[PDB]
Amino acid sequence: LRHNLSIDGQPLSLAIYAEPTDPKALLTSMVQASQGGSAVLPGTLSLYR
């Protein structure tokens, strides 16, 4: 009587389902980087044409 059950202890009020929050999806993206050139070496002038 105190816990509001039946004669055999079965609950008189149906327990709520408590539907979960459920998982979510994941995402990824691209990443870039930048660089410069190398020092220009003075070409040793040959004799050819």
Place this chain on the structure above:
Amino acid sequence: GLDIAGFMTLVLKESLNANETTQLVQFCHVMAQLSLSVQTLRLSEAELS
């Protein structure tokens, strides 16, 4: 305890070291560990840079 200069000088030296060869292989194992950790974490080029 090896810098890059000592690194390639002792590499070009034909393993003329008693324990500094052990130091060099420890250096190589450390770089291998770092590379494998980077591969496992999938750390990207720009992030590492």
